[PDB]
Symmetry: D2
Subunit: 317 residues, 4 copies
Amino acid sequence: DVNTLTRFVMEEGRKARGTGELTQLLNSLCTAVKAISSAVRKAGIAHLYGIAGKLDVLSNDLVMNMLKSSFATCVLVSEEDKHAIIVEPEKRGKYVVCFDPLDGSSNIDCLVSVGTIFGIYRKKSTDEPSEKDALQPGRNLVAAGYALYGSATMLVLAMDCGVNCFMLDPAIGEFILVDKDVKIKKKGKIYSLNEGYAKDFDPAVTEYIQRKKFPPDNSAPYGARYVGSMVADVHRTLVYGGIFLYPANKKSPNGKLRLLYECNPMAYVMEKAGGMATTGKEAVLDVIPTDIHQRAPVILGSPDDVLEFLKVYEKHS
Amino acid sequence: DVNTLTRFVMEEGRKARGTGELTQLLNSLCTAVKAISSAVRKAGIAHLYGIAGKKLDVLSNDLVMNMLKSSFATCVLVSEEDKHAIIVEPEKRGKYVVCFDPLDGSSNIDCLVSVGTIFGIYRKKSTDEPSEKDALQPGRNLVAAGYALYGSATMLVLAMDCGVNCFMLDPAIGEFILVDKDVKIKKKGKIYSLNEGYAKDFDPAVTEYIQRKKFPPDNSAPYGARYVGSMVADVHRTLVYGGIFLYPANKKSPNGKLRLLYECNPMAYVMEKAGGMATTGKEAVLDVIPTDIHQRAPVILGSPDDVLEFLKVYEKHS
Amino acid sequence: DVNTLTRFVMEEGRKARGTGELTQLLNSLCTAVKAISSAVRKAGIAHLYGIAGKLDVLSNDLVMNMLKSSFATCVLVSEEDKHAIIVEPEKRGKYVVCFDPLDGSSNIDCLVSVGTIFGIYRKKSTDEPSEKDALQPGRNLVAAGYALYGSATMLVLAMDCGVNCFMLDPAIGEFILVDKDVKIKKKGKIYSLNEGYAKDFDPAVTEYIQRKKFPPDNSAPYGARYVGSMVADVHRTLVYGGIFLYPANKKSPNGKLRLLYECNPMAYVMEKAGGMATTGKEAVLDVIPTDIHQRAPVILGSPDDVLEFLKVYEKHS
Amino acid sequence: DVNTLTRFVMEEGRKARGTGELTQLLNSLCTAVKAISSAVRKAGIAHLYGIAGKKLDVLSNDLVMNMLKSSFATCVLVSEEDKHAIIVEPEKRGKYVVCFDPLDGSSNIDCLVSVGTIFGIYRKKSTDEPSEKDALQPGRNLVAAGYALYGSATMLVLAMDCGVNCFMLDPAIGEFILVDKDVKIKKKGKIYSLNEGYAKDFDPAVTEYIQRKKFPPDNSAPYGARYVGSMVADVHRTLVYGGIFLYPANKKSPNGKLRLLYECNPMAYVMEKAGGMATTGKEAVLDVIPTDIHQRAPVILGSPDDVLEFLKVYEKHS
Ligand SMILES: COc1ccc(-c2occ(C(=O)O)c2C(=O)O)cc1
Ligand SMILES: COc1ccc(-c2occ(C(=O)O)c2C(=O)O)cc1
Ligand SMILES: COc1ccc(-c2occ(C(=O)O)c2C(=O)O)cc1
Ligand SMILES: COc1ccc(-c2occ(C(=O)O)c2C(=O)O)cc1
């Protein structure tokens, strides 16, 4: 029996018997993703090249305008904006959204996969809404996920009910549910990080990669894959198993991926799908943030691969 | 003044003073690429999942095959998907030979990684009945070669004697728009690209070159690493940003792993026409003479300074 | 403020504080409309013609399966099905839908405009659902409308709040609201019927048309338009005003157009937009049906034009 | 065996051993048509309504003009949208004259009625500097003519000396697929098409002919009536289903209202190449020599038996 993203979101909203704001939110966000997707695949590029006589800025505008006009949000934090955006009073609702509107576009000149990452919170205060309202830890997420603009476009949605993957059918502009209640493999065969930073690696990371290239017990070495686009690397880890790493080194004691709108949503999707995500010291979702653009190390993926990483991590104290 | 793939192809045909076959060929193939692109982005997938109640690389291979045959411009077609060369039936014969990988990367297309189509075109070097031998030319004889990348958008990269040209597919009207004329690769890049999970098996020269990239001698910054696992995506990133790509010969695979006729050769041609290099380690990829249509070959390609810096290490190890 | 069909439908349901069923029904039905539109415009036709080596059945299948899987319906009446379909128990909801999945399709070989017509009732009886639940008169309609696949694709949705027109953006698969709370002109300058039936016309119809071609007063005669596709002619009548006729003659004392899934929805759209729709003797929404595929004559459009006709019909009565 | 418009036009151009100009022309016009179709179906309309925070007939005329100019195949362009003929600048000139209605039916596009692009192509008949004089040839001089209908689907109908061929636009891939080879119209149809609201102004011959269709003398069934009000839609139905279409001369309009160069002539040429007829009443439409580019002409076209039966009635009334 066929199911769409919009009908799935509408039913989950019906069962919660809430105000309906989170339903309007997710429908607004899904509409923005379809618009971004069309723009990313270069619809209308012929007009810019004279047939009749910016992508990360346009994407950021779509998500902002779609979220504001949903009447479901009060605080908006974006990778593109130095400060939180406070939704005007007439359009305020009770949700806080952190998003990276087009992750990976720094390298979009080469047509690498790009994505939209988001995490949604309920306001935990009563005062006038502020940047403070988005400084909740990952565990407080009500929903998170991403849209991948790869060889095709898929939205991956995480809630307490689990992870569901919807494929965008461009013929009709509808997200079709294609993978229900996804669970990640217990252990994978692929490891993923930028190894050009090897001279700066934490010594514990240096051993784990050694263990992947050179296995102790007669096993085959892991394959290496690193697209350089987080949504692409994390989705492949979800589909094929394995591990993804962008860790803390000494030249970067807090990693480089941003916590509120990259590490937390991916960590949340990973945990709801039977996987793990750690800074190294604590679970990613247990970090309490003090600044909306602060960074965080992240190692996520199949539980056996993250555990094996943690087994080695404690060997270096 | 606006320029499309069709306008570019018709204009180059005028300058070549030919029969017009290669123009129908490139136009037919470009039509197959539009159909592949549509299937890859999952048009009609709602019908597979029950809205009203064939694998992609088999579909891709059929699109390319049927479009090329029906161009009346080919005689021998070599495909990654077919163990033997296809001999185009006589009433549809033309003078060109086409080697192609109809959907390179599809081993990992389940994760929505970038995938592509790769192609290389030769002029038939015979008068007799056409045969598999007509595809056993080295890359240097290539008349036209390139790829379509099905990435964040769909781009066709077309390399000929006049140089490398990049066309963007506008899905609203199904047209390849020329967006980069006469492309050239940076002289030297800051990214290196290969699968390091095979590190225990590396040639000692490869092990040193990667070591030189992570730990630079002259106190410079180390290179960044990228490896998508899909050749078209990695090669294209190498063309746009410069850098180096490696799927080299090790000992356990003395001939590399990538296929020569429809992966190494088409990519080598694009690289050389764009001011870059592509080497097996011992000779330039385009100078290898093939003895089998599916034979493998090592490949190291990219910005000219990086392949030279690699060959210096390769020759230091005699 | 941007407004989509999805936002419009959800907002009306929120204010009504109902079960949420009618919202998923209309959302499911609109998805079926997007799929029909893609098929009508011949997407993928290159595969039927050998690039790699039924239309009104496909449409009926889309509306059927999409309505069933919405969990909001119990009885489905289709122009394509001889008897009413009773949705199986585990998928039942409290609504009844009469629909024409591809009206006009006999002339689709010439690429004339075609359409999808629908009307929605609430189950009124207390029994097990049955064909009787669909034999309500038009006045009991909860919602009705059409999709027109013309030069572009538009969904026209009429409810108690009035008539609203939504334009399908194929780049993103979204119905964009483009005409809020539309009303038909008091009097138009176009009349629409098949004048090849002239020898069989009711004597009152023959006089009314004569009045349009040869005006009694100092006025200009009406222009004539007849596409032959009910959705197309009815939409032109809403946009530009005027009158549409498919009346009772001698060969068909009950006309030819079907009451439940052609005459009723159009009459409901017409009335909610300030127009009228009459059989000649009674208003279309006042006919009590005894068989789901029964016919009814129809004269609809601007009220002054329907009235002027009714003055003539009673003169012959 | 599958054929596209692009393959078909390139193959016919090869067979004619011509300059390639008409090939460049039709490919540019077909590209303009795909872009028109995308806008007509309201692609991107969400952006005008604030999703992120120019009328169809002006855009169509601008698309067709720009594609034709930049094809290097034309010198004079006549459009319903332009008061005087357009003279293509010297550096972009070629030998063809094109008369077109860029978005016929668009006065009522608010009701989403089917609309279309109509076009006719002549060879320049002078050696002088090109001018409006070059567009005043009769229909018999037509080299190619036809239309694109933006209906329930988008179809391009192309008529040449080789006959009439119909191409369906596959929006999934942006390609015109050949779906109807060498089309021929019924000898006699069962549908008549005109605006009968103008009844008080009819020519007495039209009044009798229409009377004969509603009330048949020879005891046959009466004809059906269809009139979309959009020439391309009504003419296309007459081609696919047979029958007769009329926009004739009355007393208040002795020349009808449809324009001769870019509505009557192309439809007449398609009609004749497809085994049908098209008359002013007095002469065949293609035999009229025009004196002004925006001049009107009466037209009765369709199946040969129906136009003949009408002419018998027309000659009965002198
Ligand atoms: C799409 O799944 C959903 C949608 C909405 C909810 C939801 O739960 C409590 C709500 C509240 O109003 O407090 C609320 C909402 O409507 O904002 C839950 C899941
Ligand atoms: C697309 O650019 C082109 C097109 C055609 C050619 C071309 O050169 C020699 C030809 C020959 O007939 O021998 C020939 C062709 O027409 O097959 C070269 C480049
Ligand atoms: C399109 O907007 C809507 C959505 C829902 C309704 C609606 O009104 C009463 C309902 C009921 O439960 O009886 C009901 C529903 O939810 O079925 C009305 C308008
Ligand atoms: C679409 O099929 C075609 C294409 C081209 C032609 C053609 O015939 C004579 C030409 C000339 O240059 O005089 C000419 C052309 O190339 O303009 C004929 C049919």
